[PDB]
Amino acid sequence: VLVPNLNPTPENLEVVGDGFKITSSINLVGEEEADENAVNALREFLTANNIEINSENDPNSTTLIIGEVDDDIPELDEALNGTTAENLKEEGYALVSNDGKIAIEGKDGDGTFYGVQTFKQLVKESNIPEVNITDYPTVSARGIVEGFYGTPWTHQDRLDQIKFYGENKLNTYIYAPKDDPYHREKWREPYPESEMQRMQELINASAENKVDFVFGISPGIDIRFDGDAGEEDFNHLITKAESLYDMGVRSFAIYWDDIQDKSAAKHAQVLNRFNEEFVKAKGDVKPLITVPTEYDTGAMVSNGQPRAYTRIFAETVDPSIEVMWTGPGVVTNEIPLSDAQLISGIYNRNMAVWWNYPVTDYFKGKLALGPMHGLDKGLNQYVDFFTVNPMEHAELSKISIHTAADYSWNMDNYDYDKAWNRAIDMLYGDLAEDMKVFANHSTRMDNKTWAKSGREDAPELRAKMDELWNKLSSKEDASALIEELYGEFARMEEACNNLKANLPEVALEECSRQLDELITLAQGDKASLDMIVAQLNEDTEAYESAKEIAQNKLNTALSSFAVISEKVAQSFIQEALSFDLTLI
Ligand SMILES: CN(NO)C(=O)N[C@@H]1[C@@H](O)[C@H](O)[C@@H](CO)O[C@H]1O
């Protein structure tokens, strides 16, 4: 009957019937013409959900038809009747479920694979709704940049991330981690055989999930530009890129972010000569990607005009090259349309975004568990390439990455609160509501100086706390609000205790300290109410005992590595301790 949570939100979806049961043995049609990676993902889900494939057609089993446009499959034509992927952009597809048949038609092999992902999300206990779908991404490249400092993701983490990207229609992975010397301090050197297996698994997994594996190269550390030395180094760039191409890498990025030699013309000439002698000469290599030394608006622009570096770079760099920038700041609240307009005009092209959220490398005590927030819903006019920099914490990064998938696939309809809820619903199952309680307090990032981003922590709770102070200072009866807040604080503690008891270890290991912090803070919040209530009752002894606890709970939180709800659960105790009800 009803449609399950879907991610990304499909572009067009119509519920056209009451739904039906998928038979435990089905008819598979198109299995030989259709995209292999889509079929494998299909076979993989079918196996996992206890569904067998009929070796011969129809004891009136359910029929599943799969393939691409212009694929020679009439069964597909018939099941779709009226709806089609023919007029859809790259990566687009059509899905029709109706009266014992499911049709999956992609505009290309990527689209077929993505149709299979929607299919997998539509099925619940072998029931599927009857729908007509036509779907396609808002933005052409969507994904992750592995750009964070701190403990690296492991091999298994990366394999898991790649699968997750595929499942949420993210097609871009910029492999450029700090712990692989072959991407920076050993950039000249091809990978030795002792490393080829590990690299190949990543490349293979990526391909198989329709994820573009971008090899990030940072030659800035020691690259030479002039004379024989500069020629030798340019030749090493080629040989490196070839040797990766030989492994099946078809996407490359060259970073200029950490170079001392701030020479725009030298940077851009290397790019252009690489574009020509490598990217153009191979023919199946995707557009070149670069990060210029000036890569946030503040570094790039002064008084509406490009600074010298940016101006030279914009003027030299080939128009075919993708150029990354991080928005108005390195870590900032927003990218408004005007910022993307300004930078895109300077570079006379659609821009690539490197979004520094949920990354927490600059403020590691806190977990960034909120949605894409602050990004202009019209950014696609000036941007056709979107990536996020996630946390060293791979598992909990999925919450925010999940919302980036929705934002970049269906930008016009993105709603950060709804996407945030959906991400936690789809990821946490029976723990979703408890995980929301916790994550809600840990969305806002702010190092107090240059780095700030994300949705405010617990906005509703924060508004209730404000009303408490307003009522108490106005000598209005606050009895009912106090009871309500006791409810909120008990809920925070209970949720956090259930997460400690029941979160799978893969998630718990990333957040155990922050859970303990929020519990401490919730207990200090409760003691803070006890303080106020004592003052209302003129019970000096009850006031002193509540105050001692509130202060010790605050102090435990302030001294701990873990950071959470600074402006909300934490600040409330400080507000309560500075409040003097005896003088109102
Ligand atoms: C675009 N870019 N360098 O290529 C980038 O964002 N670099 C780092 C980025 O790697 C880091 O995670 C972030 C927060 O500390 O700071 C930035 O300066």
Numbering used by the authors: 41 to 624
Sentences from the paper on this structure:
To further investigate the mode of inhibition of STZ, CpOGA activity was measured using the 4-methylumbelliferone-GlcNAc assay with a range of STZ concentrations and varying preincubation times of enzyme and inhibitor (2 min–18 hr). Thus, in agreement with the structural data that show free, intact STZ binding to the OGA active site, there is no evidence for a time-dependent suicide/covalent inhibitory mechanism. Although our structure of the CpOGA-STZ complex does not support formation of a covalent intermediate or a tight-binding oxazolinium ion as recently suggested (Toleman et al., 2006), this complex was obtained by soaking procedures and cannot be taken as conclusive proof of the absence of such mechanisms. Nevertheless, in our hands, STZ, either resynthesized or from a commercial source, is a weak but purely competitive inhibitor without any evidence of time-dependent inhibition. Early kinetic characterization of OGA has shown that the enzyme is inhibited by GlcNAc, but not by GalNAc, unlike the GH 20 lysosomal hexosaminidases (Gao et al., 2001). Indeed, mutation of Asp401 to an alanine abrogates CpOGA activity (Rao et al., 2006). Inspired by the CpOGA-STZ complex, the galacto isomer of STZ (Gal-STZ) was synthesized.
The O-GlcNAcase (OGA) hydrolyzes O-GlcNAcylated proteins to the free protein and GlcNAc (Gao et al., 2001; Hart et al., 2007).
